[PDB]
Each structure stands twice: as structure tokens, then as C-alpha cells.
Design a protein around this ligand. Structure first.
Ligand code: CA
Ligand code: CA
Ligand code: NI
Lengths: 11, 106, 106
């Protein structure tokens, strides 16, 4: 599926 | 920061784009730079498959942080225009969010 | 909620894309989905102005969160494939974020 937060970190 | 390494062969055709890292703009769930780049990436890749006869080699970290597109039929004009479009869109994000995303041509 | 109104003419050519609710309150999910759709839309327009010879009638009201692309040369095959690439990318967003964005064909 699509993840708009694919390029965002955990912390 | 997300870095976007683009390789363009002798004839000017885009053969690889490699996108690596995280944008580090906001909090997980609310990062707008990541939302921008992601929508453009996955949108383009799926569109290639959907609108043209090209079937690109795709390899990625399904936990986020790494996507690789290698073109196969680099001569496919429809597919090359979609890749160009992608680059211009990501450049549009770079010029307003300078420190979150970087394009590098090889 | 972001709405996207898409007008196709009798021959299949995309005439109009209207996005609204960009700059409106929105629920959980809005900030990123709005960031996604807008990067795809403004990205596409820039690509249509830099990669093709089509010069569409463009109206962006930054205050209203109302953005309107009206095609002029509807026979420009390159511009038209950039538009259908945009639609695909917008659909990709709809598929997973049905609660924050809706596409309507007219
Ligand atoms: Ca086609
Ligand atoms: Ca109609
Ligand atoms: Ni309008």
C-alpha cells in the first residue's frame, strides 16, 4: 500500500 | 535529509533514481516533506506501470527510507516523460524545503 | 476534506482539474494528505510548463485553498500524459486515505 510517511523517521 | 541520486546516460535518458534517508521536518505522522516526496514517488512509479508498457526494476526498504527505480526500456518515451515529471516535482519540493531534500545528478 | 473535481471531454482529454479544501481545517490526516496532493498538483503543472509546449490557464487562490488547471491545447499528447499521471498519483492517495480526499469525475 502507500505510506505518506515512507520518508519520515521514528525519532 | 532525503537525498535523491539520479543517473542519466549518454543519450539523456534517466536510468536510475535512488532516494535515501528521512526528511526530518516534523514528527512521524505529520512530516509534510515526506508526504510530498512519497506521493510523487509512488504516484509516478504506479503511473508508469498503469499508463505505459514499461515495467521498471523496483527495489526498496519496505520499512521506509530507501527506494530504487531502474529503468529497463529506457527508450520508452512515455515512461521517460513520467520520470522527468517526477524529477521536476521533487525539484519543486527542494526549492522550498532546502534542507530536507537534495537532488544529485550523476 | 480535500475534493478533486476532474473534467474529461467527449474525446477523453482532461479539460479541468479543480482541487479544494487544501487550506481548510481538516481532520486527523489532513496535513499530510493535503501536502501529498498539493506537491503532486503543483509538481505536475511545473512539469507541463517545463517539458511541453502547453501553457494552461492556471488559477491558484492561496487564501481559498482553491487551485484550478484548465487545459488549452487538449491535443498536446505530452501534457495529457502528465495530467493522467497526476490523476493516477491522486488516486494512489485516495486508495489509502479515503477519509481525507475524494476524486469526482465530471
Ligand atoms: Ca499510454
Ligand atoms: Ca464530461
Ligand atoms: Ni475554478
Amino acid at each position: 500500500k502507500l505510506n505518506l510517511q515512507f520518508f519520515a523517521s521514528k525519532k | 535529509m532525503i537525498t535523491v541520486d539520479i543517473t542519466v546516460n549518454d543519450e539523456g535518458k534517466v536510468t536510475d533514481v535512488i532516494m535515501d534517508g528521512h526528511a526530518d521536518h516534523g514528527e512521524y505522522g505529520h512530516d509534510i516533506v515526506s508526504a510530498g516526496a512519497s506521493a510523487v514517488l509512488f504516484g509516478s512509479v504506479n503511473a508508469i506501470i498503469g499508463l505505459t508498457s514499461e515495467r521498471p526494476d523496483i527495489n526498496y526498504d519496505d520499512q521506509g527510507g530507501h527506494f530504487h527505480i531502474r529503468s529497463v526500456d529506457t527508450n520508452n518515451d512515455e515512461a521517460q516523460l513520467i520520470l522527468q515529471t517526477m524529477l521536476v516535482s521533487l525539484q519543486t519540493i527542494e526549492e522550498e524545503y532546502n534542507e530536507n531534500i537534495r537532488l544529485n545528478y550523476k
